[PDB]
């Protein structure tokens, strides 16, 4: 099978795990565990980091036969090409490229807030920036079913993840944006996704490691 | 012509400026200035941030007729598709996708250090990690002339920028890796690039904004 390797956290592997299920991929995962405070041992990973034949060793990785890939975006693109879930026109490619990169910015922002010792102090200020973030997603989507246009593409897996994560952080953030709420329901309603979400493989939380100040357990 | 918008620094706009040059693109640039400490005024950008019709307002931005793009990687990709500077085979595409994202990782590592108020005391620990970073680029390129294979692609633009930045930071960091020294020379050897480096438009330094601890002026 293909092998997906990542920590036993949702983290940034969610979109890949969802895409693996959506495409009926034949895969197995190696979910590495971090030890506890104080050392947060990373040895299960460290002992084989340089022994997998990865060009730039990292997590997540995907082994697919002869192919070995690192960089979550690269894995997502690889699967997208494999299963034809890319933009098909120039307009669709642009929207996808924008979305991919924007999701990563919004991801980092959350991460940066959550790994900050002054979380509680920072939070209030961060919560006020949300509406403006959501409004940009909402206006970009507009009336389309999917972020790139008429067809589900790998970018919808990314958008779903970040919008979902945002919603968990601030449950009311999507109230003024019904098209985003509708997107989340349309995405979760895809058949394989629905099945996966009820399964033993599903890992919706924790989002971060033990180091974080939120969703770290 | 196309309009490229960014700060009046090299920052992450270097690969785009180089690619617009290498492609003989017709373009005009808007280089927004930031004020000095302690306020670091961003008003020149903020005055128009929400007036350019961008989906997700940011710097850099590319305006190409009716096409408005934000996200530096997206801008690179757009320009690459227009000029046929993408991988042509799956193997080139995979190599390109990894490098793109890897470059961003190594860029962010430099920023985390350069923006840390504790820069001077952090520096030694960072330096220690350089050789490993370079080694992985070195081994990845191996004997190829370019990062994706036998022809230049947009990812050489990003690779050039990051290797050059690290070399500026630690001049001796490429001594051990002749193939990296050679790639730099090859890149700079390109006629259009060579020509640009002598032009009035060339902006090598500062690397960072005025907020940084290094290469901020
Ligand atoms: N740009 C790359 C990034 C690869 C990378 O950094 N991997 C992390 C795990 S990922 C972690 C994370 C854990 C939970 C939630 C979010 C993140 C996250 C998000 C954005 C950026 C970096 C992170 C990270 O905080 C790691 O453990 N690396 C193995 C190693 O260094 O030996 C990608 O897109 O794949
Ligand atoms: N992921 C996006 C990143 C867009 C973005 O953050 N842009 C910054 C300037 S870019 C700056 C930088 C200046 C010098 C050197 C490096 C960077 C950099 C590198 C990686 C990530 C972020 C940065 C940044 O620290 C900016 O001023 N934004 C306008 C605003 O917020 O109103 C991209 O790839 O395009």
């Amino acid at each position: 099978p293909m092998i997906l390797g990542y920590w036993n956290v949702r983290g940034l592997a969610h979109p890949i795990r969802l895409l693996l299920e959506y495409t009926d991929s034949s895969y197995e995962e190696k979910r590495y565990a971090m030890g506890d405070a104080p050392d947060y041992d990373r040895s299960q990973w460290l002992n084989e980091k340089f022994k997998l034949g990865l060009d730039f060793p990292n997590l997540p990785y995907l082994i697919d036969g002869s192919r070995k890939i690192t960089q979550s975006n690269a894995i997502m693109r690889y699967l997208a090409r494999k299963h034809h879930l890319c933009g098909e026109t120039e307009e669709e490619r642009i929207r996808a490229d924008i979305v991919e990169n924007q999701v990563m910015d919004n991801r980092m922002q959350l991460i940066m807030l959550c790994y900050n010792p002054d979380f509680e102090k920072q939070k209030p200020e961060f919560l006020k920036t949300i509406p403006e973030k959501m409004k940009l997603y909402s206006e970009f989507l507009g009336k389309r079913p999917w972020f790139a246009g008429d067809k589900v593409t790998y970018v919808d897996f990314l958008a779903y993840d970040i919008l979902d994560q945002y919603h968990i952080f601030e449950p009311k953030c999507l109230d003024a944006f019904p098209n985003l709420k509708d997107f989340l329901a349309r995405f979760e309603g895809l058949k394989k996704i629905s099945a996966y979400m009820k399964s033993s493989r599903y890992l919706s939380t924790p989002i971060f490691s033990k180091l974080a100040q939120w969703s770290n357990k």
Side-chain angles (χ1 to χ4, degrees), chain A:
Chain A
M2 311 155 65
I3 297 94
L4 168 66
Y6 189 62
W7 297 113
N8 62 162
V9 306
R10 172 180 177 147
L12 63 78
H14 207 55
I16 302 162
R17 271 172 181 148
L18 287 172
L19 219 205
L20 291 164
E21 284 284 331
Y22 180 76
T23 60
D24 207 22
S25 288
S26 170
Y27 78 96
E28 68 186 56
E29 281 183 74
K30 200 181 167 193
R31 281 188 176 173
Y32 296 96
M34 225 178 199
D36 311 324
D39 32 53
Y40 302 120
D41 191 57
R42 302 186 303 148
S43 95
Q44 233 175 46
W45 161 238
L46 294 188
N47 291 351
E48 59 176 21
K49 178 182 187 170
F50 294 103
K51 312 277 192 213
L52 295 178
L54 309 175
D55 289 304
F56 292 94
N58 221 327
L59 288 173
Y61 60 76
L62 182 75
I63 308 181
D64 184 4
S66 67
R67 263 95 208 223
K68 308 202 168 150
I69 319 183
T70 67
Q71 299 287 339
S72 66
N73 285 331
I75 292 165
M76 294 292 289
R77 287 196 184 232
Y78 169 80
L79 293 176
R81 296 187 306 268
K82 190 171 195 203
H83 297 279
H84 287 83
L85 295 173
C86 294
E88 306 190 302
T89 74
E90 189 57 20
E91 167 170 35
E92 296 164 8
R93 289 189 294 266
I94 294 163
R95 293 183 56 88
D97 290 339
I98 293 162
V99 179
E100 174 197 303
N101 290 281
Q102 183 65 35
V103 166
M104 183 74 77
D105 278 357
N106 292 146
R107 193 192 292 289
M108 298 307 311
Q109 291 159 354
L110 195 72
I111 272 126
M112 294 301 314
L113 159 75
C114 295
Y115 280 81
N116 184 351
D118 276 356
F119 176 71
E120 287 296 340
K121 208 177 53 190
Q122 298 299 134
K123 179 182 171 158
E125 278 312 62
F126 176 98
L127 289 183
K128 15 169 138 143
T129 80
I130 294 179
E132 252 22 76
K133 292 179 211 311
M134 307 293 134
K135 170 205 197 73
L136 294 168
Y137 284 103
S138 166
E139 306 180 333
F140 185 72
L141 186 59
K143 304 212 134 70
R144 306 173 226 289
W146 304 114
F147 272 93
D150 301 328
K151 41 165 288 165
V152 186
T153 59
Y154 81 93
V155 302
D156 286 300
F157 295 72
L158 297 177
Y160 166 80
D161 185 41
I162 207 61
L163 290 185
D164 179 55
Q165 286 186 26
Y166 268 77
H167 192 234
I168 293 170
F169 190 86
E170 190 31 288
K172 297 285 226 48
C173 74
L174 267 33
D175 291 342
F177 310 105
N179 61 350
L180 297 185
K181 254 170 142 186
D182 294 338
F183 170 83
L184 301 182
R186 181 192 304 108
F187 183 97
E188 280 167 6
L190 303 165
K191 194 265 147 188
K192 293 274 196 43
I193 300 304
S194 180
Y196 176 56
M197 286 173 87
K198 298 187 191 163
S199 79
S200 61
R201 307 177 293 289
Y202 186 67
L203 197 181
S204 49
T205 61
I207 299 163
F208 305 109
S209 71
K210 305 144 189 269
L211 294 105
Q213 295 296 341
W214 170 86
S215 182
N216 47 234
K217 67 149 81 154

mmCIF file of all heavy atoms in Angstrom, chain A residues 6-7 9-13 16 34 42 45-46 49-50 57-61 70-75 104 107-108 111 115 165 206-209, ligand 1:
data_model
loop_
_atom_site.group_PDB
_atom_site.id
_atom_site.type_symbol
_atom_site.label_atom_id
_atom_site.label_comp_id
_atom_site.label_asym_id
_atom_site.label_seq_id
_atom_site.Cartn_x
_atom_site.Cartn_y
_atom_site.Cartn_z
ATOM 1 N N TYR A 6 3.159 10.533 9.806
ATOM 2 C CA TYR A 6 2.922 11.812 10.475
ATOM 3 C C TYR A 6 2.829 11.516 11.983
ATOM 4 O O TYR A 6 2.734 10.380 12.365
ATOM 5 C CB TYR A 6 1.659 12.558 9.962
ATOM 6 C CG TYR A 6 1.459 13.950 10.436
ATOM 7 C CD1 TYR A 6 2.435 14.899 10.089
ATOM 8 C CD2 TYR A 6 0.409 14.383 11.254
ATOM 9 C CE1 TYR A 6 2.367 16.224 10.493
ATOM 10 C CE2 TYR A 6 0.327 15.694 11.707
ATOM 11 C CZ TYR A 6 1.304 16.600 11.358
ATOM 12 O OH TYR A 6 1.235 17.881 11.721
ATOM 13 N N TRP A 7 2.745 12.566 12.749
ATOM 14 C CA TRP A 7 2.461 12.423 14.213
ATOM 15 C C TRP A 7 0.986 11.940 14.384
ATOM 16 O O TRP A 7 0.144 12.258 13.540
ATOM 17 C CB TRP A 7 2.632 13.773 14.868
ATOM 18 C CG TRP A 7 4.070 14.283 14.760
ATOM 19 C CD1 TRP A 7 4.480 15.352 14.039
ATOM 20 C CD2 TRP A 7 5.205 13.750 15.422
ATOM 21 N NE1 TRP A 7 5.832 15.548 14.252
ATOM 22 C CE2 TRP A 7 6.300 14.588 15.080
ATOM 23 C CE3 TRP A 7 5.393 12.692 16.306
ATOM 24 C CZ2 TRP A 7 7.584 14.304 15.554
ATOM 25 C CZ3 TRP A 7 6.678 12.379 16.731
ATOM 26 C CH2 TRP A 7 7.749 13.205 16.348
ATOM 27 N N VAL A 9 -1.535 13.202 15.600
ATOM 28 C CA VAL A 9 -2.274 14.397 15.745
ATOM 29 C C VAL A 9 -2.902 14.743 14.392
ATOM 30 O O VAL A 9 -2.437 14.163 13.387
ATOM 31 C CB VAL A 9 -1.652 15.640 16.393
ATOM 32 C CG1 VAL A 9 -1.054 15.407 17.792
ATOM 33 C CG2 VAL A 9 -0.594 16.280 15.512
ATOM 34 N N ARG A 10 -3.877 15.631 14.446
ATOM 35 C CA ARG A 10 -4.569 16.031 13.201
ATOM 36 C C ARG A 10 -3.522 16.850 12.406
ATOM 37 O O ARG A 10 -3.130 16.460 11.281
ATOM 38 C CB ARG A 10 -5.764 16.927 13.556
ATOM 39 C CG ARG A 10 -6.459 17.574 12.369
ATOM 40 C CD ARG A 10 -7.593 18.424 12.788
ATOM 41 N NE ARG A 10 -8.235 19.123 11.668
ATOM 42 C CZ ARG A 10 -9.549 19.337 11.733
ATOM 43 N NH1 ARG A 10 -10.243 18.883 12.796
ATOM 44 N NH2 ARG A 10 -10.111 20.076 10.803
ATOM 45 N N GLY A 11 -3.083 17.882 13.015
ATOM 46 C CA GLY A 11 -1.994 18.767 12.574
ATOM 47 C C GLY A 11 -2.117 19.200 11.145
ATOM 48 O O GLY A 11 -3.046 20.004 10.977
ATOM 49 N N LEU A 12 -1.162 18.849 10.260
ATOM 50 C CA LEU A 12 -1.369 19.264 8.848
ATOM 51 C C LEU A 12 -1.599 18.026 7.989
ATOM 52 O O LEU A 12 -1.575 18.189 6.748
ATOM 53 C CB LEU A 12 -0.338 20.267 8.379
ATOM 54 C CG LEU A 12 1.103 19.838 8.331
ATOM 55 C CD1 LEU A 12 1.334 18.982 7.095
ATOM 56 C CD2 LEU A 12 1.976 21.098 8.172
ATOM 57 N N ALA A 13 -1.850 16.870 8.558
ATOM 58 C CA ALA A 13 -2.063 15.668 7.741
ATOM 59 C C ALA A 13 -3.566 15.490 7.383
ATOM 60 O O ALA A 13 -3.889 14.520 6.684
ATOM 61 C CB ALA A 13 -1.628 14.386 8.410
ATOM 62 N N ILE A 16 -4.605 15.339 3.739
ATOM 63 C CA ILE A 16 -4.032 14.214 3.010
ATOM 64 C C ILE A 16 -4.825 12.942 3.361
ATOM 65 O O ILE A 16 -5.145 12.153 2.483
ATOM 66 C CB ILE A 16 -2.508 14.015 3.353
ATOM 67 C CG1 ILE A 16 -1.764 15.363 3.004
ATOM 68 C CG2 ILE A 16 -1.941 12.751 2.641
ATOM 69 C CD1 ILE A 16 -0.381 15.418 3.718
ATOM 70 N N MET A 34 4.823 11.353 20.253
ATOM 71 C CA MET A 34 5.804 12.189 20.962
ATOM 72 C C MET A 34 5.733 11.805 22.449
ATOM 73 O O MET A 34 4.596 11.510 22.898
ATOM 74 C CB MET A 34 5.404 13.647 20.800
ATOM 75 C CG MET A 34 6.570 14.540 20.465
ATOM 76 S SD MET A 34 5.831 16.200 20.276
ATOM 77 C CE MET A 34 7.117 17.048 19.340
ATOM 78 N N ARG A 42 11.055 12.784 20.892
ATOM 79 C CA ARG A 42 10.664 12.628 19.472
ATOM 80 C C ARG A 42 11.427 11.453 18.843
ATOM 81 O O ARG A 42 11.449 11.315 17.602
ATOM 82 C CB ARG A 42 10.916 13.850 18.615
ATOM 83 C CG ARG A 42 10.288 15.176 18.959
ATOM 84 C CD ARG A 42 10.555 16.206 17.924
ATOM 85 N NE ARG A 42 11.968 16.436 17.659
ATOM 86 C CZ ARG A 42 12.474 16.782 16.465
ATOM 87 N NH1 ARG A 42 11.781 16.921 15.334
ATOM 88 N NH2 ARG A 42 13.780 17.045 16.418
ATOM 89 N N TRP A 45 10.502 8.863 15.803
ATOM 90 C CA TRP A 45 10.670 9.530 14.510
ATOM 91 C C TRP A 45 12.174 9.731 14.217
ATOM 92 O O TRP A 45 12.651 9.370 13.129
ATOM 93 C CB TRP A 45 9.901 10.809 14.300
ATOM 94 C CG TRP A 45 10.328 11.756 13.223
ATOM 95 C CD1 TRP A 45 10.697 13.084 13.382
ATOM 96 C CD2 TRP A 45 10.412 11.499 11.814
ATOM 97 N NE1 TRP A 45 10.970 13.655 12.164
ATOM 98 C CE2 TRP A 45 10.835 12.677 11.195
ATOM 99 C CE3 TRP A 45 10.121 10.390 11.035
ATOM 100 C CZ2 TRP A 45 10.988 12.806 9.817
ATOM 101 C CZ3 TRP A 45 10.379 10.469 9.671
ATOM 102 C CH2 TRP A 45 10.758 11.665 9.071
ATOM 103 N N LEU A 46 12.833 10.344 15.171
ATOM 104 C CA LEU A 46 14.255 10.655 15.053
ATOM 105 C C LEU A 46 15.096 9.445 14.723
ATOM 106 O O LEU A 46 16.030 9.603 13.900
ATOM 107 C CB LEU A 46 14.689 11.547 16.215
ATOM 108 C CG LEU A 46 14.166 12.944 16.388
ATOM 109 C CD1 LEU A 46 14.914 13.691 17.514
ATOM 110 C CD2 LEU A 46 14.292 13.700 15.075
ATOM 111 N N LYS A 49 14.396 8.938 10.870
ATOM 112 C CA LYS A 49 14.319 10.131 10.047
ATOM 113 C C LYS A 49 15.217 10.043 8.793
ATOM 114 O O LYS A 49 14.764 10.387 7.706
ATOM 115 C CB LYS A 49 14.509 11.401 10.798
ATOM 116 C CG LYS A 49 14.482 12.706 9.999
ATOM 117 C CD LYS A 49 14.740 13.951 10.848
ATOM 118 C CE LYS A 49 14.564 15.249 10.115
ATOM 119 N NZ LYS A 49 14.581 16.460 10.993
ATOM 120 N N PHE A 50 16.460 9.674 9.031
ATOM 121 C CA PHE A 50 17.419 9.670 7.915
ATOM 122 C C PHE A 50 17.558 8.314 7.276
ATOM 123 O O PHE A 50 18.500 8.159 6.463
ATOM 124 C CB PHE A 50 18.768 10.270 8.347
ATOM 125 C CG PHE A 50 18.577 11.717 8.665
ATOM 126 C CD1 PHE A 50 18.515 12.123 9.984
ATOM 127 C CD2 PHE A 50 18.496 12.658 7.605
ATOM 128 C CE1 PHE A 50 18.322 13.472 10.285
ATOM 129 C CE2 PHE A 50 18.328 14.006 7.925
ATOM 130 C CZ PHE A 50 18.223 14.408 9.271
ATOM 131 N N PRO A 57 14.045 14.840 4.566
ATOM 132 C CA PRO A 57 13.271 14.145 5.613
ATOM 133 C C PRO A 57 12.402 15.089 6.418
ATOM 134 O O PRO A 57 12.742 16.182 6.888
ATOM 135 C CB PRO A 57 14.305 13.394 6.412
ATOM 136 C CG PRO A 57 15.511 13.240 5.496
ATOM 137 C CD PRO A 57 15.485 14.485 4.617
ATOM 138 N N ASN A 58 11.123 14.605 6.538
ATOM 139 C CA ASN A 58 10.151 15.490 7.242
ATOM 140 C C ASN A 58 8.817 14.692 7.499
ATOM 141 O O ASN A 58 8.722 13.601 6.956
ATOM 142 C CB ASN A 58 9.850 16.714 6.370
ATOM 143 C CG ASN A 58 9.776 18.003 7.138
ATOM 144 O OD1 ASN A 58 9.341 18.007 8.303
ATOM 145 N ND2 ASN A 58 10.045 19.163 6.488
ATOM 146 N N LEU A 59 7.969 15.392 8.217
ATOM 147 C CA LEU A 59 6.611 14.768 8.439
ATOM 148 C C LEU A 59 5.599 15.807 8.079
ATOM 149 O O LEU A 59 5.733 16.974 8.529
ATOM 150 C CB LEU A 59 6.434 14.418 9.940
ATOM 151 C CG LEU A 59 7.271 13.237 10.389
ATOM 152 C CD1 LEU A 59 7.100 13.147 11.904
ATOM 153 C CD2 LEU A 59 6.878 11.901 9.794
ATOM 154 N N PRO A 60 4.552 15.474 7.299
ATOM 155 C CA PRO A 60 4.277 14.192 6.744
ATOM 156 C C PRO A 60 5.186 13.743 5.579
ATOM 157 O O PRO A 60 5.733 14.611 4.888
ATOM 158 C CB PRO A 60 2.810 14.319 6.194
ATOM 159 C CG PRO A 60 2.673 15.780 5.882
ATOM 160 C CD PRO A 60 3.573 16.488 6.923
ATOM 161 N N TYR A 61 5.208 12.464 5.402
ATOM 162 C CA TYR A 61 5.804 11.917 4.155
ATOM 163 C C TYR A 61 4.771 10.947 3.572
ATOM 164 O O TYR A 61 3.934 10.424 4.354
ATOM 165 C CB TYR A 61 7.093 11.188 4.464
ATOM 166 C CG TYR A 61 7.134 10.007 5.373
ATOM 167 C CD1 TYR A 61 6.674 8.754 4.926
ATOM 168 C CD2 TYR A 61 7.666 10.091 6.664
ATOM 169 C CE1 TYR A 61 6.710 7.650 5.790
ATOM 170 C CE2 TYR A 61 7.653 9.039 7.561
ATOM 171 C CZ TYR A 61 7.206 7.792 7.080
ATOM 172 O OH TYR A 61 7.206 6.750 7.909
ATOM 173 N N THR A 70 7.846 14.358 0.542
ATOM 174 C CA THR A 70 7.755 15.178 1.764
ATOM 175 C C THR A 70 7.186 16.477 1.388
ATOM 176 O O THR A 70 7.123 16.770 0.119
ATOM 177 C CB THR A 70 9.102 15.268 2.610
ATOM 178 O OG1 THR A 70 9.946 16.024 1.674
ATOM 179 C CG2 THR A 70 9.526 13.887 3.088
ATOM 180 N N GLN A 71 6.802 17.416 2.283
ATOM 181 C CA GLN A 71 6.149 18.681 2.033
ATOM 182 C C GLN A 71 4.620 18.426 1.761
ATOM 183 O O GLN A 71 4.266 17.795 0.750
ATOM 184 C CB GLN A 71 6.705 19.670 0.990
ATOM 185 C CG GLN A 71 8.176 20.083 1.429
ATOM 186 C CD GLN A 71 8.163 21.003 2.609
ATOM 187 O OE1 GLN A 71 7.186 21.657 2.921
ATOM 188 N NE2 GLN A 71 9.294 21.230 3.291
ATOM 189 N N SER A 72 3.842 18.702 2.789
ATOM 190 C CA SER A 72 2.384 18.436 2.724
ATOM 191 C C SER A 72 1.783 18.959 1.415
ATOM 192 O O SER A 72 0.914 18.179 0.879
ATOM 193 C CB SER A 72 1.708 19.061 3.966
ATOM 194 O OG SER A 72 1.734 20.432 4.072
ATOM 195 N N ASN A 73 2.098 20.112 0.926
ATOM 196 C CA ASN A 73 1.544 20.655 -0.305
ATOM 197 C C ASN A 73 1.923 19.776 -1.503
ATOM 198 O O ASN A 73 1.122 19.602 -2.455
ATOM 199 C CB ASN A 73 1.846 22.101 -0.594
ATOM 200 C CG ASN A 73 1.029 23.068 0.264
ATOM 201 O OD1 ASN A 73 -0.101 22.781 0.701
ATOM 202 N ND2 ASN A 73 1.728 24.165 0.542
ATOM 203 N N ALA A 74 3.169 19.347 -1.457
ATOM 204 C CA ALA A 74 3.701 18.484 -2.545
ATOM 205 C C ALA A 74 2.927 17.161 -2.538
ATOM 206 O O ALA A 74 2.619 16.602 -3.605
ATOM 207 C CB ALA A 74 5.199 18.300 -2.415
ATOM 208 N N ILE A 75 2.660 16.629 -1.328
ATOM 209 C CA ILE A 75 1.920 15.342 -1.251
ATOM 210 C C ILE A 75 0.530 15.581 -1.861
ATOM 211 O O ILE A 75 0.034 14.681 -2.601
ATOM 212 C CB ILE A 75 1.867 14.886 0.261
ATOM 213 C CG1 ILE A 75 3.283 14.516 0.739
ATOM 214 C CG2 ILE A 75 0.885 13.639 0.422
ATOM 215 C CD1 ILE A 75 3.518 14.379 2.260
ATOM 216 N N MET A 104 -2.295 27.877 3.872
ATOM 217 C CA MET A 104 -1.048 27.725 4.685
ATOM 218 C C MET A 104 -0.817 29.004 5.499
ATOM 219 O O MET A 104 -0.418 28.759 6.705
ATOM 220 C CB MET A 104 0.087 27.210 3.785
ATOM 221 C CG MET A 104 1.356 26.977 4.615
ATOM 222 S SD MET A 104 1.172 25.498 5.614
ATOM 223 C CE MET A 104 1.428 24.146 4.429
ATOM 224 N N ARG A 107 -3.149 28.921 8.462
ATOM 225 C CA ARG A 107 -2.749 27.799 9.288
ATOM 226 C C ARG A 107 -1.656 28.240 10.276
ATOM 227 O O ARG A 107 -1.729 28.088 11.523
ATOM 228 C CB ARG A 107 -2.387 26.592 8.416
ATOM 229 C CG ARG A 107 -2.233 25.258 9.106
ATOM 230 C CD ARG A 107 -1.625 24.164 8.322
ATOM 231 N NE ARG A 107 -2.459 23.683 7.218
ATOM 232 C CZ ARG A 107 -3.567 22.976 7.419
ATOM 233 N NH1 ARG A 107 -3.933 22.706 8.672
ATOM 234 N NH2 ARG A 107 -4.243 22.427 6.405
ATOM 235 N N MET A 108 -0.625 28.830 9.702
ATOM 236 C CA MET A 108 0.520 29.367 10.469
ATOM 237 C C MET A 108 0.045 30.382 11.509
ATOM 238 O O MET A 108 0.626 30.380 12.613
ATOM 239 C CB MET A 108 1.478 30.099 9.537
ATOM 240 C CG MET A 108 2.095 29.266 8.465
ATOM 241 S SD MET A 108 2.882 27.792 9.167
ATOM 242 C CE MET A 108 3.833 28.580 10.495
ATOM 243 N N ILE A 111 -1.411 28.560 14.397
ATOM 244 C CA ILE A 111 -0.289 27.861 15.024
ATOM 245 C C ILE A 111 0.503 28.853 15.880
ATOM 246 O O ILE A 111 0.835 28.464 17.021
ATOM 247 C CB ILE A 111 0.665 27.177 13.999
ATOM 248 C CG1 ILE A 111 0.148 25.743 13.683
ATOM 249 C CG2 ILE A 111 2.173 27.120 14.357
ATOM 250 C CD1 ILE A 111 -0.007 25.600 12.138
ATOM 251 N N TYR A 115 0.852 28.381 20.010
ATOM 252 C CA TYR A 115 2.125 27.989 20.624
ATOM 253 C C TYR A 115 2.751 29.144 21.392
ATOM 254 O O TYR A 115 3.924 29.012 21.780
ATOM 255 C CB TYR A 115 3.118 27.443 19.597
ATOM 256 C CG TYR A 115 2.817 26.004 19.246
ATOM 257 C CD1 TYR A 115 1.824 25.685 18.333
ATOM 258 C CD2 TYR A 115 3.505 24.976 19.894
ATOM 259 C CE1 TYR A 115 1.555 24.347 18.005
ATOM 260 C CE2 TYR A 115 3.235 23.635 19.601
ATOM 261 C CZ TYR A 115 2.269 23.343 18.644
ATOM 262 O OH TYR A 115 1.992 22.058 18.299
ATOM 263 N N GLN A 165 -11.150 23.979 11.284
ATOM 264 C CA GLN A 165 -10.283 24.283 12.449
ATOM 265 C C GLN A 165 -10.696 25.620 13.031
ATOM 266 O O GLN A 165 -10.856 25.751 14.293
ATOM 267 C CB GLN A 165 -8.776 24.216 12.058
ATOM 268 C CG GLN A 165 -8.218 22.822 11.849
ATOM 269 C CD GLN A 165 -6.705 22.890 11.614
ATOM 270 O OE1 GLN A 165 -6.051 23.847 12.063
ATOM 271 N NE2 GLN A 165 -6.186 21.909 10.891
ATOM 272 N N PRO A 206 -6.546 15.628 18.893
ATOM 273 C CA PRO A 206 -6.092 17.010 19.002
ATOM 274 C C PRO A 206 -5.531 17.477 17.662
ATOM 275 O O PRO A 206 -5.061 16.656 16.866
ATOM 276 C CB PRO A 206 -4.907 16.941 19.999
ATOM 277 C CG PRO A 206 -4.367 15.556 19.718
ATOM 278 C CD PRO A 206 -5.638 14.714 19.589
ATOM 279 N N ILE A 207 -5.572 18.781 17.524
ATOM 280 C CA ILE A 207 -5.080 19.458 16.328
ATOM 281 C C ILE A 207 -3.573 19.629 16.422
ATOM 282 O O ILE A 207 -2.874 19.366 15.436
ATOM 283 C CB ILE A 207 -5.894 20.795 16.158
ATOM 284 C CG1 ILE A 207 -7.376 20.420 15.974
ATOM 285 C CG2 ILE A 207 -5.293 21.625 15.001
ATOM 286 C CD1 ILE A 207 -8.371 21.580 16.215
ATOM 287 N N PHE A 208 -3.120 19.991 17.613
ATOM 288 C CA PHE A 208 -1.677 20.207 17.861
ATOM 289 C C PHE A 208 -1.088 19.177 18.814
ATOM 290 O O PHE A 208 -1.732 18.262 19.350
ATOM 291 C CB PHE A 208 -1.479 21.634 18.370
ATOM 292 C CG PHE A 208 -2.030 22.708 17.489
ATOM 293 C CD1 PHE A 208 -3.149 23.445 17.855
ATOM 294 C CD2 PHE A 208 -1.406 22.992 16.272
ATOM 295 C CE1 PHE A 208 -3.657 24.452 17.035
ATOM 296 C CE2 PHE A 208 -1.921 23.948 15.408
ATOM 297 C CZ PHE A 208 -3.023 24.709 15.804
ATOM 298 N N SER A 209 0.204 19.339 19.046
ATOM 299 C CA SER A 209 1.017 18.519 19.955
ATOM 300 C C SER A 209 0.702 18.979 21.392
ATOM 301 O O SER A 209 -0.100 19.888 21.624
ATOM 302 C CB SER A 209 2.520 18.712 19.711
ATOM 303 O OG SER A 209 2.943 20.007 20.159
HETATM 304 N N1 LIG C 1 6.240 22.814 5.260
HETATM 305 C C1 LIG C 1 6.159 21.433 5.788
HETATM 306 C C2 LIG C 1 6.214 21.489 7.341
HETATM 307 C C3 LIG C 1 6.621 20.273 7.964
HETATM 308 C C4 LIG C 1 6.859 20.212 9.437
HETATM 309 O O1 LIG C 1 7.058 21.358 9.954
HETATM 310 N N2 LIG C 1 6.762 19.025 10.018
HETATM 311 C C5 LIG C 1 6.566 18.893 11.469
HETATM 312 C C6 LIG C 1 5.107 18.446 11.861
HETATM 313 S S1 LIG C 1 3.965 19.638 11.297
HETATM 314 C C7 LIG C 1 3.865 20.603 12.670
HETATM 315 C C8 LIG C 1 2.401 20.876 12.984
HETATM 316 C C9 LIG C 1 1.798 20.044 13.977
HETATM 317 C C10 LIG C 1 0.449 20.237 14.318
HETATM 318 C C11 LIG C 1 -0.257 21.295 13.697
HETATM 319 C C12 LIG C 1 0.331 22.113 12.724
HETATM 320 C C13 LIG C 1 1.690 21.936 12.389
HETATM 321 C C14 LIG C 1 2.385 22.831 11.394
HETATM 322 C C15 LIG C 1 1.683 23.637 10.450
HETATM 323 C C16 LIG C 1 2.411 24.425 9.553
HETATM 324 C C17 LIG C 1 3.802 24.408 9.531
HETATM 325 C C18 LIG C 1 4.491 23.579 10.429
HETATM 326 C C19 LIG C 1 3.783 22.829 11.361
HETATM 327 C C20 LIG C 1 4.563 21.935 12.323
HETATM 328 O O2 LIG C 1 4.437 22.713 13.564
HETATM 329 C C21 LIG C 1 7.658 17.953 11.990
HETATM 330 O O3 LIG C 1 7.508 17.295 12.993
HETATM 331 N N3 LIG C 1 8.662 17.796 11.159
HETATM 332 C C22 LIG C 1 9.531 16.598 11.301
HETATM 333 C C23 LIG C 1 10.949 17.082 11.486
HETATM 334 O O4 LIG C 1 11.307 18.267 11.564
HETATM 335 O O5 LIG C 1 11.857 16.202 11.809
HETATM 336 C C24 LIG C 1 4.952 20.667 5.266
HETATM 337 O O6 LIG C 1 4.058 21.484 4.781
HETATM 338 O O7 LIG C 1 4.926 19.465 5.302
#
